[PDB]
Amino acid sequence: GKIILFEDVEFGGKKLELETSVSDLNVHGFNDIVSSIIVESGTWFVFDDEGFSGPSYKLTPGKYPNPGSWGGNDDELSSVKQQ
Numbered sequence: 419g420k421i422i423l424f425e426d427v428e429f430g431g432k433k434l435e436l437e438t439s440v441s442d443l444n445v446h447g448f449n450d451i452v453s454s455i456i457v458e459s460g461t462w463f464v465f466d467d468e469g470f471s472g473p474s475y476k477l478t479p480g481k482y483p484n485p486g487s488w489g490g491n492d493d494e495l496s497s498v499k500q501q
């Protein structure tokens with residue numbers, strides 16, 4: 419699986435590419451800043467709390483240009499897990 423997290427909407431700003439689960443996005447300086455997402459491959463769950471907990475959102479391959487596109491809130495993702 420490969421997911422790319424973006425600081426700004428419409429795939430702008432700083433980006434973080436991940437191929438493994440991350441229980442705490444702070445380790446990569448990406449806690450509570452994500453505003454768009456591209457899933458290149460795999461199914462991913464993204465969570466608003468650390469540790470694969472809090473509000474969760476399922477994402478399959480494709481582009482998600484704003485948090486509404488995954489049903490979520492801006493600047494709230496804290497952990498991500500591969501399905």
Ligand SMILES: [Ca+2]
Binds near residue numbers: 452
């Ligand atoms: Ca942001």
Ligand SMILES: [Ca+2]
Binds near residue numbers: 465467494
């Ligand atoms: Ca959060």
